[PDB]
Each structure stands twice: as C-alpha cells, then as structure tokens.
Design a protein around this ligand. Sequence first.
Ligand code: 4F1
Ligand code: HC3
Length: 241
Amino acid sequence: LTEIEHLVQSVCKSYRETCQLRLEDLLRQRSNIFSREEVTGYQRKSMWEMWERCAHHLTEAIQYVVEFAKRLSGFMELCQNDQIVLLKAGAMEVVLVRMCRAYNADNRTVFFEGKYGGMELFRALGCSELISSIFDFSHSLSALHFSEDEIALYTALVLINAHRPGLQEKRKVEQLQYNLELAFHHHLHKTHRQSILAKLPPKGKLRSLCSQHVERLQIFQHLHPIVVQAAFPPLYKELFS
Ligand SMILES: O=C(O)c1ccc(-c2nn(C(=O)c3c(Cl)cccc3C(F)(F)F)c3ccccc23)cc1
Ligand SMILES: C[C@H](CCCC(C)(C)O)[C@H]1CC[C@H]2[C@@H]3CC=C4C[C@@H](O)CC[C@]4(C)[C@H]3CC[C@]12C
C-alpha cells in the first residue's frame, strides 16, 4: 500500500534471500554441540589453518551482507564511492549483528562448521580478548530476541548511515536512511516491539568492536593472506590492498 509498507516487505525479502543460515536450522541444531575431543582437535590446529577457515567463513559472511545491500531499494542508485564507503564501515558491523542468530546465550556457544562451540574453539588464533568481546556483544544482543524482520530492518539502518565520513552525495544517503528509519519505527509499532529501541547497542560500541575486529583481520591478512573471488571488486581492492 504505502511506499513504506513495500519498503518493509523489500528489506525483509532481501534479508530472507541473503540471511545465509536459516533461523529454524540454527535453533534446531543447538543440541548438536562439539565434544571435548572435537574442541581439542580445533585447539591443536595451527594458527594459520584456523585463520584460513575463519577468514573464508568471515569473507563469505561479508559477501552475503554485500548482496543484502545490493538488494535494498536505492542502494544501487548511490554513486560507487558511497556504496564502498557504506559497506566498508558497515558490512562487518552487520556480520557482528547477524552472529546473534547463531549464538546460544544458555551455554555461550556459536554455530561453527556444523556444530555449536564456545570461544575456546578458537584458542589457536591467540585472539582471546577480541573473541571474548565478540561473544559478549552477541550475548547482549541475544536478550532482545530479535525477530527476523527486526534483524532485517536494523541491519539495513546499520549500513544506510549518512554520518559515515567520506560520502559524496550525503543528501541521497539521508533520503534512504529516513525511509528505513520510518519503515523500522512503523514495523515495531505495528508489532508492539518499540521496547527494543531503548535496548539497541550504543552506536559507539558496534563501531568500536567492528574497528578492533577489522584491524585484527588486517594484521592476519598481512601475515598470512587469503584470496577470494571479490563480489564487489572496488570494495575488495580497498580492504585487500
Ligand atoms: O567479495 C568482496 O567484494 C569482499 C569480501 C570481503 C570484504 C571484507 N573483508 N573484510 C575483512 O575485514 C576481512 C575478512 Cl572478512 C577476511 C579476511 C581479511 C579481511 C581484511 F583483510 F579486510 F581485514 C571486511 C571488513 C569490512 C567490510 C568489508 C570487508 C570486502 C569485499
Ligand atoms: C568469533 C569467531 C573468531 C574470529 C577470529 C578472528 C578475530 C581472527 O577473526 C568467528 C570465526 C567465524 C565467524 C562466523 C562466520 C560466519 C557466520 C555466519 C553469519 O551469518 C553470522 C556470523 C557467523 C556465525 C560468524 C561469527 C563469528 C565467527 C564464529
């Protein structure tokens, strides 16, 4: 009906098509937990092997978020500089939010390579403080019990942010952001879920965690670089320079 009800539907559809893992599958698999043996198996792998596994999973996760963006109304009519600026600042913020779906707060486990495991799975990477910050962020998001439509609309707003430094057509990003803000508010009101607004992470916290993650990924990429077929080569070239 309204341009806004369609925008809600097209964001939720984009998300459904790019969500990478199905929520019912992730909820169904929570009982499928790595044994002590499988865990010491991961812990004994080289840093460089665990880095190769985790780098490729994270790159693929980023590629689902790039596709999500490309399918948001108006994203493809932004100039290429602004597309790169938004995804560079936002795509890994969206991956970190998407993680909460694959996270079980009851035993603090994440779905990884077909089973749930704790952060000790990743010991060989020697990243314990950063990995702990990532699990704690997922742990605090788990309390919101995001619906699929909430996660879709919230992650759209994570990407479409006119405050990112470097934008060339700030007013064009503002028009998309305000339509998505109205879509999000409208949807929460229609579903009696406005209470999540007071509980969303402070913007500073997501940007800060994302900044520490990407800096650590860039250090590993520097020491032991992986390659992938770039989904968005201009963005890829600006991360893997
Ligand atoms: O397929 C692509 O076009 C593409 C695929 C991935 C990205 C992208 N990688 N990335 C990383 O942090 C990253 C990852 Cl996930 C794995 C290994 C090394 C890295 C690092 F070198 F960049 F640090 C990002 C952060 C923020 C935003 C986009 C990306 C960008 C583009
Ligand atoms: C927290 C750990 C370790 C990160 C290690 C470091 C800091 C070197 O990158 C990472 C490794 C792999 C990541 C998952 C990859 C894919 C997905 C699917 C996506 O839909 C949601 C996020 C998730 C589950 C990632 C979570 C973070 C993981 C476990």
